[PDB]
Write a protein that binds this DNA or RNA. Structure first.
Ligand code: NA
Ligand code: NA
Length: 327
DNA sequence: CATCTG
DNA sequence: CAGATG
């Protein structure tokens, strides 16, 4: 956690690069189990050889570890942090809509900057465009004080469209968090479930209302169950307009809301322990359901859940306020 | 995993 | 349809 930190960090720089710049998914994955294990390792790694002793740790990595321990640096790491091509890819990738793949294409075409991008707006797709247009707003965190106003609007409009909708704002926002990166709404309706064959309108109507009143400004991607967009809190009395914020809305069959809701609220850590505990308690849990574990190895059958309560209950646990869902 | 692009 | 992005 701090004993093999530099090592784990270097390995991470390395892994990322294989994957983003080179195409090296193997190598890339290589660096990763490595950091994973050295990370778990209980002592202070004093040499390559020592590491090498670990699984995932081979000779090449061992080698690297040596030089890093030998000197506060690594040449290769040093070489890469300079390299403009590598840098460009890390940068372009920052735009919503640009993954490594595209980052490579553009670079090879000479687009390496924001400006490059603007000049070449023709080569970018809709998502990518939006991403470019709101590069700044997109990188800005979302303070809870805004978050509450957003939630305030969303929930109100949903209610108006149908009294039966149930919306929830998951994420860190839900666990306390002073700021967040984006708005995540989980949505369901009684008239939508596991069996029930579809109901796209269910999601389209809300999206539409949100646009009606102007809260939603652009569409990144709109499916029949998942909407990805951009929204904005109406600028008050002109002098201070708000940043453009990322937002997602997803329809869920009512028969698996809370597991979803549970799940999305996190944290990853909370999940895990919760998950692991479930298991002890003779249970299974994933994003959509909780199932009674048979003994034959495994088994299933969705347990019936009416709230996040039913869940804990199941695994016989202490109902946790979202704030304390931390770890 | 769901959506988009080409 | 494969392949990309989130
Ligand atoms: Na990106
Ligand atoms: Na292939």
């Amino acid at each position: 956690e701090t004993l093999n930190g530099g090592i784990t960090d270097m390995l991470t720089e390395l892994a990322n690069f294989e994957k983003n710049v080179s195409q090296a998914i193997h190598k890339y994955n290589a660096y990763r189990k490595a950091a994973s294990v050295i990370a778990k390792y209980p002592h202070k790694i004093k040499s390559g050889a020592e590491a090498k002793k670990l699984p995932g740790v081979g000779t090449k990595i061992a080698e690297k570890i040596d030089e890093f321990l030998a000197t506060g640096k690594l040449r290769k790491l040093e070489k890469i942090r300079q390299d403009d091509t590598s840098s460009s890819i890390n940068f372009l990738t920052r735009v919503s809509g640009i993954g490594p793949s595209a980052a490579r294409k553009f670079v090879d075409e000479g687009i390496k900057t924001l400006e490059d991008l603007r000049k070449n707006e023709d080569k970018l797709n809709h998502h990518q465009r939006i991403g470019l247009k709101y590069f700044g707003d997109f990188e800005k965190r979302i303070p809870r004080e805004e978050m509450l106003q957003m939630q305030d609007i969303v929930l109100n409009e949903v209610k108006k469209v149908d009294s039966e909708y149930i919306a929830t704002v998951c994420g860190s926002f839900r666990r306390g968090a002073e700021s967040s990166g984006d708005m995540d709404v989980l949505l369901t309706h009684p008239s939508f479930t596991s069996e029930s064959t579809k109901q796209p309108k269910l999601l389209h109507q809300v999206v539409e209302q949100l646009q009606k009143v102007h809260f939603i400004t652009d569409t990144l991607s709109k499916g029949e169950t998942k909407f990805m967009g951009v929204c904005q809190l109406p600028s008050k009395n002109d002098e201070k307009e708000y940043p453009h914020r990322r937002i997602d809305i997803r329809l869920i069959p009512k028969d698996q809301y809370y597991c979803g809701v549970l799940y999305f609220t996190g944290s990853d850590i909370f999940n895990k322990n919760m998950r692991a505990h479930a298991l002890e308690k003779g249970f299974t849990i994933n994003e959509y359901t909780i199932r009674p574990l048979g003994v034959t190895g495994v088994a299933g059958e969705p347990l019936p859940v009416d709230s996040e309560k039913d869940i804990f209950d199941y695994i016989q646990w202490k109902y946790r306020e979202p704030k304390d869902r931390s770890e």
